[PDB]
Amino acid sequence: TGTNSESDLSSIQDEIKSRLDEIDRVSGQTQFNGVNVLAKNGSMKIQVGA
Amino acid sequence: NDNQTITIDLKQIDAKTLGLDGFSVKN
């Protein structure tokens, strides 16, 4: 919006970059049984037969 | 695990670190 000044835009950008860094952190740190699920393209195979 | 942290920042706020050192309105 044009009403916002440059300092207000700076504050909004600071909050936005903080939340994007939060997203990146959640992506990197989340791990299940020694597997970083949301950190690399791959495929999981579940043996559901005899 | 190790190195799984969030960093918080602390800025020293006082008269010197704000330019309000010597603020006078009289001679």
UniProtKB/Swiss-Prot annotation, chain A:
Superkingdom field: Bacteria
Subcellular location: Secreted; Bacterial flagellum
Family according to the record: Belongs to the bacterial flagellin family.
Role, per record: Flagellin is the subunit protein which polymerizes to form the filaments of bacterial flagella.
Protein name: Flagellin
